[PDB]
Amino acid sequence: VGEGLGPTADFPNGRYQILAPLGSGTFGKVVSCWDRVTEQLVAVKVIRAVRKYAEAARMEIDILLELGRKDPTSRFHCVRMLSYFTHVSQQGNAHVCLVFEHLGPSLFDVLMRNHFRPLPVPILRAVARQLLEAITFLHEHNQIVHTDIKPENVLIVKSDYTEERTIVNPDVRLIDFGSASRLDKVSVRHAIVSTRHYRAPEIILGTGWSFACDIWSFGALLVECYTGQTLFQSHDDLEHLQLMQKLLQHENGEVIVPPPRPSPSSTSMGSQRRREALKLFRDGRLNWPEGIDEQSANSLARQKSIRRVARMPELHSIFRPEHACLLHLIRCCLTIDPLKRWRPSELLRHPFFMS
Ligand SMILES: [Ca+2]
Description:
The protein is of the alpha+beta class.
């Protein structure tokens, strides 16, 4: 902190003076910075010179250029990239740096600051609306899928506050386009995408994901805003799918069904994924709980999973009677079949947003 990034003729110690940390992750670090040229606060994302995260940073730049061209003022609530540069470190490491408008706390930071208590519904509604506007812009105006919708990637960059500090009138930015994919030509993909807790079932099952996987993540995000708590807390595919089945078991038509079995000759990424997913099934049904151990009749692992699934609520029981409208909205999102999920422009017409 206190160094500069992006040396220039006028500012050889760096145009962007590092002020404070903002966030970090496997991608690298985000720092609050003073732009010595325009004399503004900005946020700069510096990607670790690791190649994996650096080539992701370059596709992010490309998408953000197109989003910013179509929406300079972020009326559709995607983060605005102001600039980008390569910071050749004094060692020799070149870091890809993205310069963003001044940012703000994430939804995760908000939940954490409130001790993972429920977000009040009027704020939930305002955040949900702006995030759907962002997702509509991506899917329908740009044919881009984000794939990484989660609390850490939804920022409140501007916000009035009511006094501890409450949040009123949030101004949302969706961030992190380093995993976004253009789907205007290629309709379906099969790579594993999304962080575990927000990952749609079709990604696990190998049946092909598209725009709809973002609506699943969105639905899981909203439930977490309502309860304060991550909805799917498993890191194992078999148990994760069962938690989905349990949540939705009282929703008509909501069953986890296996992918079609691939030709044994088929070498594609999608076939490989479907073969793996089929190991989660026995005679066409999800092989839970028996598939958790299957090496011991009496199993500690199997017993833990049974308790975790028993603790998982049915979707309808999460919501207070007076919040039936939000439940109806989430039902249009948390559908196991991606073809049943609503488009974000349709979700924006839902009565939850008129009232
Ligand atoms: Ca990410």
